[PDB]
Amino acid sequence: SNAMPLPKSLKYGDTIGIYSPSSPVTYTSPKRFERAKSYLLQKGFHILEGSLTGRYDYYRSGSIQERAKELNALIRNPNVSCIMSTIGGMNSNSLLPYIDYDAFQNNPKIMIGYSDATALLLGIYAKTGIPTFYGPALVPSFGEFEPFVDDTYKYFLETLLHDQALPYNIKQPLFWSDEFINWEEKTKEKELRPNNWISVTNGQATGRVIGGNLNTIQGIWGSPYMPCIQEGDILFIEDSSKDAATIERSFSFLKINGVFDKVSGIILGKHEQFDDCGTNRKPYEILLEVLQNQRIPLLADFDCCHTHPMITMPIGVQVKMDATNKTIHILEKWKI
């Protein structure tokens, strides 16, 4: 395709602005927050704390208007190169009518986070056409103890800072964990589980990748902030810390919306701490029941979700997915 507007690559010493569009994690998990900031500061970045850092409004950081103001102040700040959520929650979608999309279009930046921040990552892409990034949120991702935080950091640098020739191969992490330990304080080493991706349904697909957190997508679906899924797109979806009933609802939501009639392939993230409700079924097995007799190439257990470590994934750019050989390549520039 034609060259398009893109954000500048991250550079050492750049300022990362952090904001809390939903849960007040900088108040409720202060140790992991302080550790995450120090991790990135020690690497040589600067952190600009958004205006709701340290504030507390129970389930949220502040009112809808306060949270929009926090994010817009970073969007409008020409000294900020990367805007990163501290954590998700449920309520990022409340901000969407109030975000300064024109200011973002005037001065594009790296927009990164995951889970509930999907509402904003997809909303910005929908309104501006600028690719956004499914990737680290400050406290869950960079507050992680060694060793996994170093793998997450490596992928973050490789995708956002290093120059990359195209096609850009996304390598499989060698080890993973989803253990529900070591949140504020470390009590033992997480298991270094040997890692694999899964070839659920063979084949290849090339298309624009669209998606993120599927639970969160249901809170923006149908609105101006949800990019239209187009014939040939690759669907990227993940859920984390849910159960079989919840993800069957979300998979059937996609099915009855015709999404599976359009997409050329599906990338499914790992499912942290999945509750199979006694069925012993895997998330991809429930998805495949929803798919019925429709064959779609499908690569599962992709490391772009709440499990550690986390890949940084551009959204809104052409990708090739090979479910038979379990490869993912990015085919279009996502940064200058």
């Binding site: 939903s22 998700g88 449920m90 889970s115 509930d116 999907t118 639970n215 859920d239 984390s240 810390s241």
Partner: peptide, 6 residues
């Protein structure tokens, strides 16, 4: 967590 958060 007791929550339904993402």
């Amino acid at each position: 967590r007791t929550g339904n958060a993402n």
